[PDB]
Structure 1
Amino acid sequence: MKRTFQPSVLKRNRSHGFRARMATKNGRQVLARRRAKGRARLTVSK
């Protein structure tokens, strides 16, 4: 059966990547929340 995750690196990076996070104003808030928590990996790029 076709499941919900059909992966693609290009769509992954355009959706959740660092440059899209910096592009939207609330994405920068997301990065602030993750840095304040102390995540090893902020976005899906690494």
Structure 2
Amino acid sequence: MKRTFQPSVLKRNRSHGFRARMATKNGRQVLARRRAKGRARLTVSK
């Protein structure tokens, strides 16, 4: 059947991408937590 993950790259970047993270204070804290953890991939952006 229709499973839950229906991929669209444009929706992925508009939902979880880098500029969507920088557009808010909470996404900037998300980026700060991932940088402090030392994530090799900060966002879903390629």
1:8-45 deviation digits (Å, cap 9, x = unpaired): 00000000000000001100000000000000000000
Aligned residues: 46
Q: For residues 20 and 45 of structure 2, what CA distance do their matches in structure 1 show?
A: 11
Q: For residues 3 and 45 of structure 1, what CA distance do their matches in structure 2 show?
A: 23
SS at match of 1:43: coil
Offset of residue 3 of structure 1:
0.1
CA RMSD of aligned residues (A): 0.4
For structure 2, the 5+ residue unaligned runs are: none
TM-score (norm 1): 0.97
Q: For residues 4 and 27 of structure 2, what CA distance do their matches in structure 1 show?
A: 24
Structure 1 segments, 4+ long, off by >2 Å, are none
- Residue identity over aligned pairs, in percent, reads 100
TM-score (norm 2): 0.97
